[PDB]
Design an enzyme around this catalytic site. Structure first.
Site, PDB file in Angstrom:
ATOM      1  N   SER A 188       0.694  -1.170  -0.035  1.00 27.56           N
ATOM      2  CA  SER A 188       0.026   0.007  -0.079  1.00 27.56           C
ATOM      3  C   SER A 188       0.916   1.125   0.022  1.00 27.56           C
ATOM      4  CB  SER A 188      -0.823  -0.088   1.199  1.00 27.56           C
ATOM      5  OG  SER A 188      -1.293   1.382   1.542  1.00 27.56           O
ATOM      6  N   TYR A 199      -1.331  -0.643  10.430  1.00 22.10           N
ATOM      7  CA  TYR A 199      -1.312  -0.762   8.855  1.00 22.10           C
ATOM      8  C   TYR A 199       0.122  -0.287   8.359  1.00 22.10           C
ATOM      9  CZ  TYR A 199      -3.515  -1.043   4.201  1.00 22.10           C
ATOM     10  OH  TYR A 199      -3.985  -1.542   3.122  1.00 22.10           O
TER      11      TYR A 199
HETATM   12  N1  NAD Z   1      -8.634  -1.205  -1.332  1.00 24.98           N
HETATM   13  C1  NAD Z   1      -7.667  -0.345  -1.302  1.00 24.98           C
HETATM   14  O1  NAD Z   1      -7.821   1.055  -1.480  1.00 24.98           O
HETATM   15  C2  NAD Z   1      -6.163  -0.683  -1.111  1.00 24.98           C
HETATM   16  C3  NAD Z   1      -5.225   0.098  -0.720  1.00 24.98           C
HETATM   17  C4  NAD Z   1      -3.903  -0.239  -0.514  1.00 24.98           C
HETATM   18  C5  NAD Z   1      -3.588  -1.540  -0.125  1.00 24.98           C
HETATM   19  N2  NAD Z   1      -4.570  -2.464  -0.322  1.00 24.98           N
HETATM   20  C6  NAD Z   1      -4.125  -3.972  -0.291  1.00 24.98           C
HETATM   21  O2  NAD Z   1      -4.899  -4.694  -1.030  1.00 24.98           O
HETATM   22  C7  NAD Z   1      -4.920  -6.026  -0.518  1.00 24.98           C
HETATM   23  C8  NAD Z   1      -6.414  -6.711  -0.817  1.00 24.98           C
HETATM   24  O3  NAD Z   1      -7.109  -5.525  -0.050  1.00 24.98           O
HETATM   25  P1  NAD Z   1      -8.694  -5.330  -0.281  1.00 24.98           P
HETATM   26  O4  NAD Z   1      -8.704  -3.768  -0.686  1.00 24.98           O
HETATM   27  O5  NAD Z   1      -9.090  -6.024  -1.783  1.00 24.98           O
HETATM   28  O6  NAD Z   1      -9.723  -5.662   0.660  1.00 24.98           O
HETATM   29  P2  NAD Z   1     -10.983  -6.381   0.550  1.00 24.98           P
HETATM   30  O7  NAD Z   1     -11.911  -6.287   1.845  1.00 24.98           O
HETATM   31  O8  NAD Z   1     -11.852  -5.948  -0.709  1.00 24.98           O
HETATM   32  O9  NAD Z   1     -10.628  -7.834   0.402  1.00 24.98           O
HETATM   33  C9  NAD Z   1      -9.450  -8.304   1.214  1.00 24.98           C
HETATM   34  C10 NAD Z   1     -10.076  -9.962   1.350  1.00 24.98           C
HETATM   35  O10 NAD Z   1      -9.142 -10.622   2.144  1.00 24.98           O
HETATM   36  C11 NAD Z   1      -9.958 -11.300   2.976  1.00 24.98           C
HETATM   37  N3  NAD Z   1      -9.046 -11.600   4.337  1.00 24.98           N
HETATM   38  C12 NAD Z   1      -9.040 -10.442   5.131  1.00 24.98           C
HETATM   39  N4  NAD Z   1      -8.137 -10.814   6.429  1.00 24.98           N
HETATM   40  C13 NAD Z   1      -7.993 -12.253   6.045  1.00 24.98           C
HETATM   41  C14 NAD Z   1      -7.418 -13.211   6.909  1.00 24.98           C
HETATM   42  N5  NAD Z   1      -7.154 -12.844   8.161  1.00 24.98           N
HETATM   43  N6  NAD Z   1      -7.254 -14.463   6.456  1.00 24.98           N
HETATM   44  C15 NAD Z   1      -7.763 -14.988   5.341  1.00 24.98           C
HETATM   45  N7  NAD Z   1      -8.491 -14.040   4.468  1.00 24.98           N
HETATM   46  C16 NAD Z   1      -8.516 -12.448   5.011  1.00 24.98           C
HETATM   47  C17 NAD Z   1     -11.231 -10.704   3.056  1.00 24.98           C
HETATM   48  O11 NAD Z   1     -12.411 -11.718   3.466  1.00 24.98           O
HETATM   49  C18 NAD Z   1     -11.231 -10.193   1.599  1.00 24.98           C
HETATM   50  O12 NAD Z   1     -11.993 -11.084   1.046  1.00 24.98           O
HETATM   51  C19 NAD Z   1      -4.676  -5.734   0.952  1.00 24.98           C
HETATM   52  O13 NAD Z   1      -3.420  -6.370   1.130  1.00 24.98           O
HETATM   53  C20 NAD Z   1      -4.329  -4.424   1.167  1.00 24.98           C
HETATM   54  O14 NAD Z   1      -3.938  -3.902   2.195  1.00 24.98           O
HETATM   55  C21 NAD Z   1      -5.776  -2.135  -0.778  1.00 24.98           C
END
Ligand code: NAD
Ligand code: NAD
Ligand code: NAD
Ligand code: NAD
Ligand code: NA
Ligand code: NA
Ligand code: NA
Ligand code: NA
Lengths: 241, 241, 241, 241
Positions: C132, C145
């Site tokens: 991120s 985070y």
């Molecule tokens: N969405 C954003 O703006 C953004 C920004 C920066 C980084 N990220 C990174 O992208 C990655 C995906 O996140 P996202 O935005 O798609 O979130 P999201 O909520 O849409 O999906 C995350 C998925 O991971 C699963 N999950 C969460 N914790 C878990 C655990 N402990 N064990 C097994 N499964 C688990 C959730 O059920 C979900 O299906 C993450 O690493 C996040 O840090 C996202």
């Protein structure tokens, strides 16, 4: 004690750096384009010498260093500080004007280092370059300034690698330094105040005294560049004009 | 007249940091797992207080801060210095041991900051984290150490943005610091020497005195990370065994 | 024809990554804590296998890899995507909860890499970590985070240096990705749109196909982190409440 | 389809970029100082146009863009690739020669962007700058090259911030790309091979197709810059000559 040369020493950051070295007991020679202000600054301060000139001109640089060697008799520290901001691509800043900014901000630091190379090596001296956080993030229409500052950040590690171990070379990237505020002005900066020339000169003198830091650029901006900002979150708002 | 707490204060970098603050006239309370060495360090230094414990244990951290508040009556500076080297994926470092490294190098700095939050805000204090250049470049088999150090570099700007403007939070990333050399050992570092604890403690005390630097990580490694190295060029050679 | 494992594959970025590899003709096994959603995702997609579990638990990670090897018979690509947002020091986030964030975002990527080490080396595979932009800049109250994300950026180059040349390991740092907007929401981002999972999955599949990029972290945030922002300038305003 | 202009398209990286865009179905106009080689390259490839000239000359740049608009009738992509390395302060590289390197590596990319500004905005185009890992680390005697490359890394985010959302601007920093090896040559690079022009052109075309990446510099160097190197450790040795 030490012989110190400073570019843009007639006002702001450069002026405070000159004062700090004077206070430390050194002799200081500075170049500046603003004759009156610089002459006043040097007036009745026997260890402070002023050379009128534009660092954009290579011939002026050589004459400056020659003048400095005459007044100081030795060069231990080179502080590359001169620079004036400008506009960029949205203003369609002309080639020649972009070039001039490079001359002042990038060519001058190189050429001065080159002119003083042997002296600094002999004296095991220091070079300090003043950049800006504009080397790492940009507002619109900042192309010339960004280019010069990005260039000087890289020139810093190049010089460090060429001149080590005899000469150590470092860079300071200031954020907002008041060289002339609402409560929003101050609150918007994580450290909660606007910077001062002393914030920069303190780091200059400190860096000059260390012997295990070289090639590094240090950000002194009250944390502004570390602040993640998205519209509508944590007090920040984008307004479409 | 500051109350200062340091982790890993019994030896090396932490030890020198403790001495520097003492010399500055402050009172210092430090935690360390090496009891005999740490007790000797504190012996007959009235303003230096030692607390035996492992920073990996949260309970110990709370007890430690309680002890410090009892001896110091106030906390102005928190220095997160404790850490121990480890191996990584090539040694197949176990999960629990990877976790342990994180407990010492990443969890502790956060928990100590959390425990001291209100005190530091009130006293307009400082937090200084000691990382490593290993946050930015790796040798093989360094996963645990890299993760903790990368984590603490980011934790630094996180804490800076949470606690500004009241508390300023910065990080120093040391290179090779002798806490114990061949001509090649020294010549290979651009600055031409191996680092010393004083190189780090000088920067620690300097950073605490500034008020326009926050969230930053400063590299203190004699320029090593800035040196571009390719086999066969400029005195460097890769040797297959 | 690759065997691909993805964490957090049941929704958002992870989900799109799974679909992209499927489209590429690979078989995919993903772990996720949201059972109903993940089961639906896998339903009637023969090459998509779902394993219910929390990546925070080391035992689950080992069982997960065992399941994957049974369904895929080979592991060519590991995508560390799972993570959940949290609070920090201003919310006084408890030690155990800070730890939990690290378990999911930092320990799991390491442990999965460790479990799959020999398989990936043998298959000349790839590891892709999702971080991120919060690794590099912070909003207030983001310590947990930030620590996990900073950790994973460093873990990336650590793994790259341990496993090269056989396995290449890279990291993508997304900005704002819509996993669910006002004119200001979109205009405030230099690229002029909010990001999509496809923006990330495109880079994931691209990075897996390259063989001269390793250890790097690529920022995919529409240029947001590169935008210099000061109150009152270029359409941005800080508002004290 | 697209109109593409490339600087230094007559050989190496620029040549491969030209071929890739041709293969993608676009029309390409490139400027290069090497007349014979460039003319051969364009021979019997109807969609590839060559303009003989030195990008150091501002007048030549305007004539080049005018020629390109005549042959392509539209400009969708500007690839700033031209550059020749040189020496630096240890060679006492002269002011005028330092300047020339800036003209080719820094002024040209700005001026071309400026000349093509309105066209690129209208066409919602892309600018790709080719830098080098020399922007971030240095070998001795590299001042001019470092300055130009540091400058172009910063120019990249400046342009991105000025021209977004209509034009996206990114930079690639190559490591060792073979444009002409012992087992040590290859083993010393973490990815275990020397780079190829295709490694760079792949990223160029990919970046041009994305719409959520802007202002970014991507390192493509087989991981070399991420490798921590200390004398006597992990196969690396410094030899004093
Ligand atoms: N969405 C954003 O703006 C953004 C920004 C920066 C980084 N990220 C990174 O992208 C990655 C995906 O996140 P996202 O935005 O798609 O979130 P999201 O909520 O849409 O999906 C995350 C998925 O991971 C699963 N999950 C969460 N914790 C878990 C655990 N402990 N064990 C097994 N499964 C688990 C959730 O059920 C979900 O299906 C993450 O690493 C996040 O840090 C996202
Ligand atoms: N002030 C800030 O907010 C800030 C922020 C980032 C970087 N900087 C850097 O700090 C350095 C000093 O800037 P400042 O803020 O003190 O500006 P300033 O205008 O207050 O002072 C600069 C001095 O340099 C002199 N000068 C300018 N061009 C010259 C030339 N061509 N030849 C000789 N002298 C010349 C001027 O006369 C002036 O006295 C510059 O390199 C600037 O890029 C300042
Ligand atoms: N020495 C270097 O070349 C170098 C380089 C980069 C970073 N660092 C960092 O500097 C800091 C200090 O390390 P050092 O080099 O002085 O090591 P050191 O061995 O000289 O001293 C570390 C001290 O911390 C104590 N300690 C270790 N684990 C502890 C724990 N779990 N709980 C309480 N005390 C503990 C040790 O007993 C020791 O007194 C560390 O954070 C390290 O990561 C050092
Ligand atoms: N090759 C590497 O190891 C490497 C590493 C880092 C960066 N780069 C960058 O890649 C880019 C291309 O370099 P390359 O390795 O392909 O070099 P190259 O010599 O193989 O090709 C560069 C081309 O540009 C042309 N050129 C040079 N100066 C010119 C000028 N003033 N006006 C018009 N044309 C000119 C040359 O004739 C040549 O065809 C450069 O920007 C360079 O800085 C290359
Ligand atoms: Na005088
Ligand atoms: Na005592
Ligand atoms: Na299924
Ligand atoms: Na042709």
């Amino acid at each position: 004690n030490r012989g110190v040369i400073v570019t843009g020493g007639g006002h702001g950051i450069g002026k405070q750096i000159c004062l700090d070295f004077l206070e430390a007991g050194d002799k200081v020679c500075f170049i500046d384009i603003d004759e009156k202000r610089s002459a006043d600054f040097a007036k009745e301060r026997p260890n402070l010498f002023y050379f009128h000139g534009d660092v954009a001109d290579p011939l002026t640089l050589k004459k400056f260093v020659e003048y400095a060697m005459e007044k100081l008799q030795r060069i231990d520290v080179l502080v590359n500080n001169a620079c004036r901001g400008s506009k960029g691509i949205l203003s369609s800043l002309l080639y020649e004007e972009f070039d001039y900014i490079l001359s002042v901000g990038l060519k001058a630091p190189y050429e001065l280092s080159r002119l003083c190379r042997d002296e600094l090596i002999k004296n095991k001296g220091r070079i300090i370059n003043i950049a800006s956080t504009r080397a790492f993030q940009s507002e619109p229409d900042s192309e010339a300034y960004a280019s010069a500052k990005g260039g000087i950040v890289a020139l810093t590690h190049a010089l460090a690698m060429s001149l080590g171990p005899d000469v150590l070379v470092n860079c300071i990237a200031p954020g907002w330094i008041n060289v002339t505020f609402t409560q929003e002005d101050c609150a918007a900066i994580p450290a909660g105040k606007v910077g001062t020339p002393k914030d920069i000169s303190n780091m200059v003198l400190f860096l000059c005294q260390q012997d295990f830091i070289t090639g590094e650029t240090i950000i002194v901006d009250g944390g502004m560049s570390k602040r993640m900002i998205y519209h509508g979150d944590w007090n920040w708002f984008y307004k479409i004009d």
